[PDB]
Amino acid sequence: VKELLEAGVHFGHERKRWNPKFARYIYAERNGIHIIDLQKTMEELERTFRFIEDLAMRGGTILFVGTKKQAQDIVRMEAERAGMPYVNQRWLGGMLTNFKTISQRVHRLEELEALFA
RNA sequence: GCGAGGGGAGCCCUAGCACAGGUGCUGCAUGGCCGUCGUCAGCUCGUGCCGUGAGGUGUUGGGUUAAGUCCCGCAACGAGCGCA
Ligand SMILES: [Mg+2]
Ligand SMILES: [Mg+2]
Ligand SMILES: [Mg+2]
Ligand SMILES: [Mg+2]
Ligand SMILES: [Mg+2]
Ligand SMILES: [Mg+2]
Ligand SMILES: [Mg+2]
Numbered sequence: 001v002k003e004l005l006e007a008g009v010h011f012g013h014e015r016k017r018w019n020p021k022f023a024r025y026i027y028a029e030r031n032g033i034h035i036i037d038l039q040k041t042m043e044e045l046e047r048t049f050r051f052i053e054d055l056a057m058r059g060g061t062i063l064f065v066g067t068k069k070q071a072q073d074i075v076r077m078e079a080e081r082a083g084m085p086y087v088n089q090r091w092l093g094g095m096l097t098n099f100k101t102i103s104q105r106v107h108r109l110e111e112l113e114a115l116f117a
Numbered sequence: 118g119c120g121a122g123g124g125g126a127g128c129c130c131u132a133g134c135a136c137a138g139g140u141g142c143u144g145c146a147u148g149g150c151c152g153u154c155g156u157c158a159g160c161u162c163g164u165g166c167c168g169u170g171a172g173g174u175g176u177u178g179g180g181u182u183a184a185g186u187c188c189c190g191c192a193a194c195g196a197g198c199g200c201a
């Protein structure tokens with residue numbers, strides 16, 4: 001059922017902005033718009049969720065992210081409904097890399113709850 | 118020591134030694150203090166990111182303000198010397 005749902009209404013959309021690499025992942029390009037390969041997508045989904053199966057059970061944490069409007073809300077509920085980290089708003093430069101200083105802002109957060117109750 | 122006479126401290130003259138004192142230089146040897154641009158809106162540090170590097174980014178941009186004042190946006194995130 002996971003396969004036919006995708007085939008339903010969740011594939012192909014972009015046009016005239018394609019990379020040479022995303023081309024081999026393509027199935028066709030009629031009406032002037034690209035059409036992603038559903039078959040290869042499944043196989044990739046398999047390999048991905050395999051990494052998910054390990055990652056989830058390893059106890060590790062996934063950092064979700066999406067600034068696109070169509071994904072801000074979707075990833076929002078789905079990240080909380082899993083307790084996993086995520087950022088829908090404008091991603092900051094250094095969040096992962098310069099993490100030490102980004103955390104200082106998280107520390108400024110607890111200060112708020114202090115003078116909030 | 119009853120008296121004579123002797124030495125020391127305080128203080129002086131004369132002779133002699135070490136030394137004092139100098140509004141005599143050098144404000145390009147300096148401390149300190151002061152004028153000045155100008156109360157003008159500025160100048161930087163920490164880490165991250167870009168560049169081979171000098172360095173950039175932040176502090177640029179849009180609105181606003183006496184002001185780097187505040188807001189929104191932002192590969193940047195905070196802080197410090199200033200403004201208040
Ligand atoms: Mg469905
Ligand atoms: Mg063409
Ligand atoms: Mg941002
Ligand atoms: Mg005598
Ligand atoms: Mg002399
Ligand atoms: Mg001088
Ligand atoms: Mg001087």
Ligand SMILES: [Mg+2]
Nearest residue numbers: 142143144145
């Ligand atoms: Mg002179």
Ligand SMILES: [Mg+2]
Nearest residue numbers: 167168169170
């Ligand atoms: Mg480098």
Ligand SMILES: [Mg+2]
Nearest residue numbers: 167168169170
């Ligand atoms: Mg080179």
Ligand SMILES: [Mg+2]
Nearest residue numbers: 172173174175
């Ligand atoms: Mg620099």
Ligand SMILES: [Mg+2]
Nearest residue numbers: 173174175176
């Ligand atoms: Mg600069």
